[PDB]
mmCIF file of C-alpha atoms in Angstrom:
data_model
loop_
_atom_site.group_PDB
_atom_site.id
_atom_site.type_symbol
_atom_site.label_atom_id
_atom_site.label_comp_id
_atom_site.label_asym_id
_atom_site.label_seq_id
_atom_site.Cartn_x
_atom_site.Cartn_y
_atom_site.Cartn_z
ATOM 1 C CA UNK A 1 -26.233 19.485 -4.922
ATOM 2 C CA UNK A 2 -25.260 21.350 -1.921
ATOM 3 C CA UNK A 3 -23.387 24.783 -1.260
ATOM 4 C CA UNK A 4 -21.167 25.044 2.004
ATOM 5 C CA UNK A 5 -22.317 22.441 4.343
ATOM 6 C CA UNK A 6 -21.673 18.696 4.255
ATOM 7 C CA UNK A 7 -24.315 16.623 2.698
ATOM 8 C CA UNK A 8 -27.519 14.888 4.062
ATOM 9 C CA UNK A 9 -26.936 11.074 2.392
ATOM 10 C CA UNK A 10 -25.300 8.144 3.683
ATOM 11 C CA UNK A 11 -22.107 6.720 2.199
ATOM 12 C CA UNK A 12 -20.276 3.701 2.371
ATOM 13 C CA UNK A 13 -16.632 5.168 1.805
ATOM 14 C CA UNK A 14 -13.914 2.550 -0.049
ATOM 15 C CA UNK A 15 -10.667 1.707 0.414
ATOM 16 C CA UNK A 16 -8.001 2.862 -1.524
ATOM 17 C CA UNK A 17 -4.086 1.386 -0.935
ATOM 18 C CA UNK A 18 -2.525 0.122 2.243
ATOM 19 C CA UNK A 19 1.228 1.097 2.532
ATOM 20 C CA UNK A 20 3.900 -0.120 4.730
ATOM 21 C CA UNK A 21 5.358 2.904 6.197
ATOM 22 C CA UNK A 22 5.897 1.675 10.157
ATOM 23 C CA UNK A 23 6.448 5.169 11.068
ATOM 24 C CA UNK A 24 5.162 7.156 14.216
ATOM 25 C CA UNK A 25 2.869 9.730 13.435
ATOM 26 C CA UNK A 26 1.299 12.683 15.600
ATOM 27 C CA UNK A 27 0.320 15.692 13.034
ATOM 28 C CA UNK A 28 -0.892 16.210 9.421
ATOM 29 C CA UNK A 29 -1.228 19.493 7.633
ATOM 30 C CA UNK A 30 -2.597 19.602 3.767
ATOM 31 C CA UNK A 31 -1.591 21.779 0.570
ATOM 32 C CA UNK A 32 -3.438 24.186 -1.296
ATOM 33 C CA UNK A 33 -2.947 25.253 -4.924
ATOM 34 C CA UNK A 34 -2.500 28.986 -5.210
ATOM 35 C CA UNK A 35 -2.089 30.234 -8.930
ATOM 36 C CA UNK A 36 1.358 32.420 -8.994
ATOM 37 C CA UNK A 37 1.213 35.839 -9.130
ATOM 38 C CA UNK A 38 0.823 38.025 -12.182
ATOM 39 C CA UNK A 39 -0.036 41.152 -13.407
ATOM 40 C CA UNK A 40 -3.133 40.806 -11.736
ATOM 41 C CA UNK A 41 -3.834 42.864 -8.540
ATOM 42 C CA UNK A 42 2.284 40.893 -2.434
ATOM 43 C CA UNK A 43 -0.287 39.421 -4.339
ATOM 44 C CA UNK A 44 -1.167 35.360 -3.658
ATOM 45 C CA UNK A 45 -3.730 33.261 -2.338
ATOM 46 C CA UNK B 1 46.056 -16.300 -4.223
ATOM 47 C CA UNK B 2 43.082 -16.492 -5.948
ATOM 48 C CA UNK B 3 40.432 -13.490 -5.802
ATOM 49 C CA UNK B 4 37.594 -14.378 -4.118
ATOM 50 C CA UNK B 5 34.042 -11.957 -4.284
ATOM 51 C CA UNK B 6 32.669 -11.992 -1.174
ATOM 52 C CA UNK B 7 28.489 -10.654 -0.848
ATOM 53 C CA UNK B 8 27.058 -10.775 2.460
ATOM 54 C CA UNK B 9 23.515 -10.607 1.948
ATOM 55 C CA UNK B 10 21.499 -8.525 4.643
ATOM 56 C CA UNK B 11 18.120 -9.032 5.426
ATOM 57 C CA UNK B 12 16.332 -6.822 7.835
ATOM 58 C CA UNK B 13 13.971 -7.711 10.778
ATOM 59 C CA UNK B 14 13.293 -4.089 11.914
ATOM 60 C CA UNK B 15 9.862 -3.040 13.117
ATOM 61 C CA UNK B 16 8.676 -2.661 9.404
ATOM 62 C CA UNK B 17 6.826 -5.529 7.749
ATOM 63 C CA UNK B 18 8.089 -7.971 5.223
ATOM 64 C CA UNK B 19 8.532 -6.511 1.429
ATOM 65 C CA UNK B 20 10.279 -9.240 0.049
ATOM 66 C CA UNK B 21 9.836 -12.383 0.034
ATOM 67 C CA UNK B 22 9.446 -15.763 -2.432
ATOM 68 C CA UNK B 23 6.098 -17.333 -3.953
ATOM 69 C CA UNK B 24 4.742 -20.662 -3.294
ATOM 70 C CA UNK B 25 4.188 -21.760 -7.140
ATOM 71 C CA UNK B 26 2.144 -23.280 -8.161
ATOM 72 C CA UNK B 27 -0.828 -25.931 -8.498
ATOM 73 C CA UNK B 28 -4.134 -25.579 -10.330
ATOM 74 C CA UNK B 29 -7.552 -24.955 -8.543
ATOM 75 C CA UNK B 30 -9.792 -28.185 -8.642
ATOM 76 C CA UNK B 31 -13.692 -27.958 -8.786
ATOM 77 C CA UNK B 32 -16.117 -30.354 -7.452
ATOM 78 C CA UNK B 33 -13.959 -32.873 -5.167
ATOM 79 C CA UNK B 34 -13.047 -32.365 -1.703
ATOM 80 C CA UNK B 35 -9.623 -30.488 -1.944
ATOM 81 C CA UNK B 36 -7.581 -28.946 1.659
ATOM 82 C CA UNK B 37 -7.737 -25.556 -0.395
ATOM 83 C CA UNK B 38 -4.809 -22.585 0.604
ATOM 84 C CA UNK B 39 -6.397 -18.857 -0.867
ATOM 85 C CA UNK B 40 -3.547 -16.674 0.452
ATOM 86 C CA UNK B 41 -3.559 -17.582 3.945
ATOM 87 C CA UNK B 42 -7.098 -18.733 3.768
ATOM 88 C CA UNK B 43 -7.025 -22.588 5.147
ATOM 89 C CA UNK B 44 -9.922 -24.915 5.192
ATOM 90 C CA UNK B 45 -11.765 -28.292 3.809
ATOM 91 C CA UNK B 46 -14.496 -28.610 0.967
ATOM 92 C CA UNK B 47 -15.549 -28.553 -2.147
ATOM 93 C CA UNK B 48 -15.412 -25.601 -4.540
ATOM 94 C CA UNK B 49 -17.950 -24.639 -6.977
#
């Protein structure tokens, strides 16, 4: 019901999946969908 | 001089948990009677209802 900032409730947040990786691990970085450029005013984002 | 096919079979102990392995099947579950009961690594005595 909010804008920008995080909510005000409290939730109990569920698991999902385990998975067997046995990997280190030190950094993450996500992905962002960015519609390709058209004739539409290089032009991204 | 007979062909024989060899397999060696590998089976890996690294530092990555098991992800194959065989079942122990099966028996039927038993209600009401004192039964030493084994839920998927869960071990103890009594009586299901």
């Amino acid at each position: 019901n909010l804008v920008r900032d995080l909510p005000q409730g409290f939730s109990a947040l569920e698991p999902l999946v385990d998975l067997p990786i046995g990997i280190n691990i030190t950094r993450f970085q996500t992905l962002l969908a960015l519609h390709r450029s058209y004739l539409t005013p290089s032009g991204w984002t | 001089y007979q062909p024989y096919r060899v397999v060696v079979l590998s089976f890996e102990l690294l530092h990555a948990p098991a992800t194959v392995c065989g079942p122990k099947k099966s028996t039927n579950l038993v209600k009401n009677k004192c039964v030493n009961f084994n839920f998927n690594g869960l071990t103890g005595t009594g009586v299901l209802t």
